[PDB]
């Protein structure tokens, strides 16, 4: 499994034995993501939410017949201290799953 995030945390993610790439911009992120998925063996890909919140639709052309790469949006280092409420993210999940936008 590989992750894509800022270059500051790439060394930390390689510290745990994982595969780590650094990125600094959105189009860099999408190009890197398609180069990531065009080869196999990479079951899980983590993409920071500050640069690409919705990764499975940015690159959907290359896996629509193959559900092997599990893409995942993760919170960055800045959000880890400045805080973020998961309720909005879960409401968005309710949106692109069933779409009635009704939840408390």
């Amino acid at each position: 499994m590989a992750v894509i995030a800022d270059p500051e945390t790439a060394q930390g993610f390689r510290l745990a034995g994982l595969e780590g790439y650094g990125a600094s911009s959105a189009e860099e992120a999408q190009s890197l993501l398609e180069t990531l998925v065009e080869r196999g063996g990479y079951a899980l890909v983590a993409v920071d939410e500050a640069l690409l919140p919705d990764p499975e639709r940015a690159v959907e052309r290359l896996m629509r017949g193959r559900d092997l790469p599990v893409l995942l949006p993760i919170a960055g280092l800045k959000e880890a201290f400045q805080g973020h409420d998961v309720e909005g993210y879960m409401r968005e999940l309710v949106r692109k799953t069933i779409g009635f936008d009704i939840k408390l």
Partner: protein
């Protein structure tokens, strides 16, 4: 359709069959929604646990980079072996196949377990806890989405 009495009776039977199938499908949809709204809560809990782990892992990484230095941390990072593409074993939800990831990685078999640095190995432990936390979120979220398209199909 040729107009006969027998054909009229057959069509009247088919109307009842469709009207009963509608209610049966509605019951199936309710049964699916019941599990969906139970799974979403566990997804939320997993996400907040992941955030909590990320906070301490990133704090440890920042503190280790600031005080020990960047080059020593980079060398310790190159001193680790990579993990392989651990198995995505199959799993059945409501008659559909989904992958399930495995958290088993060779802990302790990673090279250089102890030595000179002090703040880097704690950051390594925090980051491997973070990696352990991430796959749980992945495994729950994929099942959540897969229940989602089943709801869509039944509707």
């Amino acid at each position: 359709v040729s107009p006969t009495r027998m054909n009229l009776l057959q069509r009247r039977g088919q109307l009842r069959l469709a009207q009963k199938g509608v209610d049966l499908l509605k019951k199936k949809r309710d049964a699916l929604v019941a599990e969906f709204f139970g799974l979403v809560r566990e997804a939320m809990e997993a996400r907040k646990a992941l955030d909590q782990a990320a906070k301490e892992a990133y704090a440890a990484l920042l503190l280790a980079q600031a005080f020990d230095g960047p080059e020593v941390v980079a060398g310790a990072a190159l001193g680790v072996p990579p993990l392989e593409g651990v198995e995505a074993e199959v799993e059945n939800v409501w008659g559909s196949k989904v992958p399930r990831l495995k958290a088993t990685f060779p802990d302790g078999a990673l090279l250089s377990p102890v030595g000179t640095p002090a703040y880097t190995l704690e950051a390594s432990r925090a980051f491997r806890r973070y990696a352990e936390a991430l796959i749980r979120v992945a495994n729950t979220e994929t099942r959540l989405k897969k229940i989602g398209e089943e709801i869509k199909k039944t509707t």
